Amino acid sequence: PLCSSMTIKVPTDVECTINKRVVTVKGKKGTLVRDFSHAPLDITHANDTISVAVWFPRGKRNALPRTICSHIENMFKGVTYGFEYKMRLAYAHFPIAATVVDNNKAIEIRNFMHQIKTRRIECLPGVTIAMSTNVKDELILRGISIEDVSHTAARIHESLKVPNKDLRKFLDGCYVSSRGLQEQ
Amino acid sequence: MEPTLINLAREYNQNMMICRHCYARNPLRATNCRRCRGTNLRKKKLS
Amino acid sequence: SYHRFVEAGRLVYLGDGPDKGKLAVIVDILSTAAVLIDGPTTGVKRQVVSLRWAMLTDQVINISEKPTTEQLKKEIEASPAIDTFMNSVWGKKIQQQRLRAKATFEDMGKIAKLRRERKMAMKRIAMSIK
Amino acid sequence: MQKYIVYGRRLPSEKFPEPEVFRMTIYAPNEIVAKSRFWYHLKSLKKIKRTHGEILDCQHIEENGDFVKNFGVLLRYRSRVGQHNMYREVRETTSARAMDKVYSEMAGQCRARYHDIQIINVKEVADEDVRREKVAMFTQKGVRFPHPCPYVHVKRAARTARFQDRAPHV
Amino acid sequence: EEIKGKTFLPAIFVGYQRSRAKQRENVALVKVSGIYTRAETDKVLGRLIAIIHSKSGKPIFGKICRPHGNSGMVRARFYTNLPGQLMGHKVRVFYDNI
Amino acid sequence: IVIDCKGHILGRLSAIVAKELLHGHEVALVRCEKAIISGAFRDVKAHYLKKMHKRTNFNHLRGPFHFRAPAEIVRRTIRGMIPYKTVRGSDAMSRLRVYDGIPPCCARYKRVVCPSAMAYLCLRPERRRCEVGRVAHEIGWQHAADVERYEKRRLEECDKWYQDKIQIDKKIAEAAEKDAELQRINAELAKYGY
Amino acid sequence: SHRKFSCCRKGNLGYLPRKRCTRGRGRCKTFPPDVQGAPIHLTAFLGYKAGCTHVMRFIDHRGSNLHNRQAIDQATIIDAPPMICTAIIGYAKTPKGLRAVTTVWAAHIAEPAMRRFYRNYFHAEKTAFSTYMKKAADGTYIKEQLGRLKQHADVIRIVAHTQPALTPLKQKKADIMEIQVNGGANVAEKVDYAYALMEKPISIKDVFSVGAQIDTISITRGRGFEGVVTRWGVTRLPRKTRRGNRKVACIGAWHPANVQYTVARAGQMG
RNA sequence: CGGAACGGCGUCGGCCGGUCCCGACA
RNA sequence: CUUCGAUGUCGGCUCUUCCUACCGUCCGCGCGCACCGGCGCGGAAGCGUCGGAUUGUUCACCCGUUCAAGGGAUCGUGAGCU
RNA sequence: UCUAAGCGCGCACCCCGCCUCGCGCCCCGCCCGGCCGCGCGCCCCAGCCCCGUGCCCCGUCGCCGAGCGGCCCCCGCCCGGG
């Protein structure tokens, strides 16, 4: 009899169709479909509001509905505006040098602590990197969906890792900062 | 040496918590470290 | 869970238990684990059955609060669902099941012979149309 | 299992010319088990053992099975560490089946067999005062939930001998 | 042969009735197909069942006596106890009485 | 009898198959690289890699041989439940034929799926189950891609075949107005019900 | 007790068993990767070994001890008899590894190649290929069979007869070594390269470019049943030893009561 | 999952308690 | 408890396998972690863990080295030796 | 909020390739014959799409032909030199 529901309302601009557990979401920036067949959810849509409606909630089943309605909201927010998870390269004595390579889909970062090897980051499908004139050494990662662009960010901070020496003194590295939704 | 950037970087690095049993970094406000399940043992170190 | 939900008045087929085959209206939801059933028409005396035994049938009959027996009979008679379930294909298989129930050894001999005749004919129709 | 009511008296002596009839209601599978429970309680509460008393009568009562009622049971139990007090609420048509549910839940989850539980009190409470949340949901006017295990409708497994031409659809 | 004109319902001789230690060859277990309940093994109780002895070319018959189990298996004995090579072959409950 | 082992728990199905081989029915399991072994993959792999570690220390050849490919895994599983040493068992194990995918004889045999042993039904959702294929390319079967190349092919051809069969099958019952009609009243609806 | 001081198990175990090689001569077993779209080239060739030299060469190796300094290195000369394509073999990627489809021989098999089929040539029937030669040589059976290989088999190989007469070897019986067209743009292109080469001489200069690195596979030289001291490299036991110094002292511990696969013992050393 | 002293916002329950529709400094 | 109608009995040599409660290397975190060092964990048995003086030595010591962890296998290993 | 779903990464370890052996197996050559069987949609369970069937007769009267699959048959030394 128990059920966990977090009714989320589709914005007027966005359009969503839920077939099985797969949802196709379209708006302005593009179309993103996510497969949600990893969990039990009566993801009935209807009205102007999607419903997640899990059934017979045991301990884990209470969490799934809210997560899959917050996630479905990230799909709606991304298609209207896009998440611009920007990052700022921070350097000390040796300045970090960044180049956008494959027509804004790739980055090459060098001179991290004068390390001869040049690090290479390829952007995941649906994201683009852009160097920014707005701030010194700011890189803007702009993407249609949060999972695709945020995960690009996870690779960049990880690729630039100081091998040894205490991290508190040796803080050199790129780090994600603003997570705001603006640029595609 | 950088200013606002070394503050953000400190948040990523210096700011966190370390449980003695797990010997692992944990969220700032977490009641229990994921690895050392449930322990309250905690601490961080600074410059 | 998009259709056929356990609720008040859903006509159900008790798959397992001393009542096997009988179709009765659900009267009260005792618990999620077990639900009260009572079919005056199909002679299923009211008893609490585990929900596992009940096999939900789409037909749902309108019921008054806690009908007990006297009210249920009039409700069952008034509702067209009891006849309608039999009319649908599961209902007709349910009826085919009723015929297969009274099996006699000698009858099986008559049935197997007829079954062979259908199979041989099926190859013959298959031979006829290429 | 059968909700017997047991009346008993201590054997009459000169000093206590008449004992007082003491009555208890014991839920037990068979009357012979029931009488053992009626005495064990009267041994602990009123210091009268079976040899020193005569069970005046044992009476089986059968409740009405036609309507569902919300039964709250107060049941003392023994865990490996020791004795505890508990209130378990179940919904069942007859007080014997509510007792059955309590003795399969407190024996299934709290691992105490019938012999270790002294039923402090069984009562049928109305919907407004029901305390445990599980009896609270199905107390509603219309409780619509999907079938819990439509999967278990595959009992046809033995009949098909696991040789069905195609996989079944739930 | 004596019985080449009885249609029959199939059955498989699974094994001798045998405890994990002792074995009794005086009885044989036939799992008659089409039977899934012990109560329904009564409809076949007492009927002639024949095995096609590979070596003889001749059928060794035998009769059903009592239900052997809840699943539906039935106990039956034959004119001479089956050799053991015949185990797993096909045994037929003759649909016709004779 | 040919079984589409897709979706059947290697364990549940193997029990049901050993009994029919002992009943002399000769069963062949096809699509046995699609059995789901219950449990997480990072765990159902560990217990198998343990069973590939156990090997005689005087000479690895004399001791247990471990079969990496999925077809010989579902045979080795069903072997434990067959008295393979005894001659009854030796014939039974021989009767079983295991085919990954449906490569030759099984490509046309009628296919029966067991409902009792079916994993989708047998386990509660959230149990976590791994296809024998994911374990197979992890312990060491190198032809998983070399099986995808035959399996993809068969389905593509089968789909055109099914479209063709639809027409011939429709024509089958258009002519079912003959003796098939008489035997049906006489049996199917004679209260025989079959 | 235990091993006390720690050493190593002498002798790579991958090469076990150390036995007389059953295969007649070196066998490819693995062929270079296909890399579709590469220059269309043949992967292998067969030669016969000859005496060693002492060539002197100049090393232009940046950051090296001998950079820009004359040095001498040792090379082994191999006679390369020019081979002739005698047939095209197809292989289909299959669930069981590689299964072959429609091997086609040439219209005329070469005379040294014919000798291979018979144990003795003069005192033999010489009937092999009698039906095939009549069957082909009209250039029709060859074309259709080659078409089957192209349609149903991805991997294509050239059976090649090598000529033993050109070299001093008294073999006199052609040996057949499979070569694989690799880098063909699509399955069709590889077969057409082979057909042009059907019954045609290929010399090593065509197969291997100068200055490339190549792999040498051969049945190695042997010395007969050898003692453990050379067969496995075990240290000689102290001079004063009854029953002889040259032998492993203990072939197993008591509890693993058998001889272990790795334990060193006498074997064919070659 | 031979086996403890200790731990476990792992999961289902219970006991003894305080808050809060004067809705949990506004 | 088992062996007295006898399981050859310390160590060294020699040879193989294992064990992990990891000494160096491999891995990610912690420090009283600037660096270099050092240290504290968790995963990990792949590899290396030597040459010598004295004593039968199991040890123990000392010298030197690419700095040198422990163990088991009938105190592994005598129709292998000494 | 590092995990519950989902997802990125990640050990001189592990597994595999490469490498040593290879039971069997295969395509051609010689030869070109004998023999047995008759049976195909797929995908999905919280859309399960109208379900919860079907087979239930391998002699029981089925075996022609084809089409599909299987099975079987082969194929010396002696003697010299290395």
mmCIF file of C-alpha atoms in Angstrom, chain F residues 43-152:
data_model
loop_
_atom_site.group_PDB
_atom_site.id
_atom_site.type_symbol
_atom_site.label_atom_id
_atom_site.label_comp_id
_atom_site.label_asym_id
_atom_site.label_seq_id
_atom_site.Cartn_x
_atom_site.Cartn_y
_atom_site.Cartn_z
ATOM 1 C CA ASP F 43 31.891 -11.801 -6.656
ATOM 2 C CA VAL F 44 30.609 -14.663 -8.909
ATOM 3 C CA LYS F 45 33.951 -14.212 -10.709
ATOM 4 C CA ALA F 46 36.063 -14.595 -7.567
ATOM 5 C CA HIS F 47 34.571 -18.020 -6.652
ATOM 6 C CA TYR F 48 35.142 -19.250 -10.234
ATOM 7 C CA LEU F 49 38.712 -17.936 -10.335
ATOM 8 C CA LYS F 50 39.209 -19.827 -7.082
ATOM 9 C CA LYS F 51 38.012 -22.963 -8.913
ATOM 10 C CA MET F 52 40.592 -22.308 -11.709
ATOM 11 C CA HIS F 53 43.351 -21.903 -9.076
ATOM 12 C CA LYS F 54 42.771 -25.371 -7.515
ATOM 13 C CA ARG F 55 45.099 -27.603 -9.693
ATOM 14 C CA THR F 56 47.143 -30.750 -8.771
ATOM 15 C CA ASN F 57 50.641 -29.747 -7.562
ATOM 16 C CA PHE F 58 52.555 -32.838 -8.841
ATOM 17 C CA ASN F 59 51.364 -32.360 -12.453
ATOM 18 C CA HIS F 60 48.601 -29.934 -13.465
ATOM 19 C CA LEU F 61 47.494 -32.380 -16.186
ATOM 20 C CA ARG F 62 46.667 -35.351 -13.891
ATOM 21 C CA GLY F 63 44.539 -33.081 -11.623
ATOM 22 C CA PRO F 64 41.260 -31.231 -12.262
ATOM 23 C CA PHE F 65 40.953 -29.654 -15.735
ATOM 24 C CA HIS F 66 39.037 -26.327 -15.636
ATOM 25 C CA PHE F 67 36.973 -25.336 -18.713
ATOM 26 C CA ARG F 68 36.916 -21.581 -19.475
ATOM 27 C CA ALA F 69 34.358 -21.592 -22.330
ATOM 28 C CA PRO F 70 30.626 -21.197 -21.379
ATOM 29 C CA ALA F 71 29.404 -24.332 -23.135
ATOM 30 C CA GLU F 72 31.740 -26.589 -21.122
ATOM 31 C CA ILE F 73 30.953 -24.651 -17.922
ATOM 32 C CA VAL F 74 27.239 -25.565 -18.091
ATOM 33 C CA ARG F 75 28.254 -29.181 -18.838
ATOM 34 C CA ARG F 76 30.704 -29.324 -15.890
ATOM 35 C CA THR F 77 27.974 -27.831 -13.632
ATOM 36 C CA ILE F 78 25.400 -30.403 -14.765
ATOM 37 C CA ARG F 79 28.121 -33.079 -14.425
ATOM 38 C CA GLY F 80 28.316 -32.813 -10.645
ATOM 39 C CA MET F 81 24.596 -33.729 -10.552
ATOM 40 C CA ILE F 82 25.162 -36.822 -12.805
ATOM 41 C CA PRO F 83 26.916 -40.045 -11.564
ATOM 42 C CA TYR F 84 29.460 -39.630 -14.415
ATOM 43 C CA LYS F 85 31.690 -42.428 -13.082
ATOM 44 C CA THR F 86 28.872 -44.976 -13.388
ATOM 45 C CA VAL F 87 27.865 -46.174 -16.900
ATOM 46 C CA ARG F 88 24.277 -45.003 -16.386
ATOM 47 C CA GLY F 89 25.799 -41.571 -15.873
ATOM 48 C CA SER F 90 28.326 -41.808 -18.709
ATOM 49 C CA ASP F 91 25.543 -42.326 -21.296
ATOM 50 C CA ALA F 92 23.464 -39.574 -19.706
ATOM 51 C CA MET F 93 26.294 -36.998 -19.845
ATOM 52 C CA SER F 94 26.874 -38.043 -23.479
ATOM 53 C CA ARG F 95 23.157 -37.477 -24.302
ATOM 54 C CA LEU F 96 23.474 -33.768 -23.280
ATOM 55 C CA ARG F 97 24.713 -31.492 -26.072
ATOM 56 C CA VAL F 98 25.732 -27.902 -25.217
ATOM 57 C CA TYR F 99 25.838 -25.195 -27.917
ATOM 58 C CA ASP F 100 26.849 -21.538 -27.343
ATOM 59 C CA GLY F 101 24.465 -19.628 -29.566
ATOM 60 C CA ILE F 102 22.547 -21.901 -31.998
ATOM 61 C CA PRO F 103 25.252 -22.797 -34.655
ATOM 62 C CA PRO F 104 24.096 -25.963 -36.590
ATOM 63 C CA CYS F 105 21.582 -28.678 -35.601
ATOM 64 C CA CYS F 106 19.858 -26.440 -33.052
ATOM 65 C CA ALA F 107 19.237 -23.597 -35.558
ATOM 66 C CA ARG F 108 16.001 -25.342 -36.638
ATOM 67 C CA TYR F 109 14.999 -27.494 -33.629
ATOM 68 C CA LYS F 110 11.768 -26.497 -31.740
ATOM 69 C CA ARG F 111 12.764 -24.498 -28.622
ATOM 70 C CA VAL F 112 11.353 -25.027 -25.087
ATOM 71 C CA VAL F 113 12.074 -22.616 -22.143
ATOM 72 C CA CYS F 114 11.704 -23.804 -18.493
ATOM 73 C CA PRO F 115 9.564 -21.372 -16.431
ATOM 74 C CA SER F 116 10.486 -22.730 -12.947
ATOM 75 C CA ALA F 117 14.226 -22.312 -13.450
ATOM 76 C CA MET F 118 13.855 -18.956 -15.212
ATOM 77 C CA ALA F 119 16.015 -16.345 -13.353
ATOM 78 C CA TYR F 120 13.895 -13.262 -14.218
ATOM 79 C CA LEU F 121 11.125 -14.940 -12.224
ATOM 80 C CA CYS F 122 13.173 -17.034 -9.738
ATOM 81 C CA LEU F 123 15.110 -14.225 -8.015
ATOM 82 C CA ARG F 124 13.740 -11.065 -6.331
ATOM 83 C CA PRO F 125 14.695 -7.848 -8.191
ATOM 84 C CA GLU F 126 17.862 -6.304 -6.668
ATOM 85 C CA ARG F 127 19.490 -9.719 -6.096
ATOM 86 C CA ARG F 128 22.240 -8.708 -8.693
ATOM 87 C CA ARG F 129 22.867 -11.376 -11.406
ATOM 88 C CA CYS F 130 25.753 -11.892 -13.899
ATOM 89 C CA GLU F 131 25.374 -13.445 -17.405
ATOM 90 C CA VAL F 132 27.727 -16.462 -17.908
ATOM 91 C CA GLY F 133 29.138 -14.508 -20.872
ATOM 92 C CA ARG F 134 30.426 -11.665 -18.645
ATOM 93 C CA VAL F 135 32.156 -14.307 -16.462
ATOM 94 C CA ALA F 136 33.277 -16.199 -19.615
ATOM 95 C CA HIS F 137 35.313 -13.382 -21.207
ATOM 96 C CA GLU F 138 36.630 -12.534 -17.713
ATOM 97 C CA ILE F 139 37.958 -16.012 -16.874
ATOM 98 C CA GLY F 140 39.264 -16.419 -20.452
ATOM 99 C CA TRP F 141 36.870 -17.336 -23.330
ATOM 100 C CA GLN F 142 38.363 -15.440 -26.306
ATOM 101 C CA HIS F 143 35.497 -16.158 -28.773
ATOM 102 C CA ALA F 144 32.726 -14.079 -27.151
ATOM 103 C CA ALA F 145 33.040 -11.639 -30.107
ATOM 104 C CA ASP F 146 33.374 -14.735 -32.365
ATOM 105 C CA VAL F 147 29.972 -15.865 -30.970
ATOM 106 C CA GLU F 148 28.342 -12.405 -31.354
ATOM 107 C CA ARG F 149 29.279 -12.646 -35.013
ATOM 108 C CA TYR F 150 27.255 -15.858 -35.521
ATOM 109 C CA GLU F 151 24.365 -14.966 -33.168
ATOM 110 C CA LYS F 152 23.733 -11.534 -34.712
#
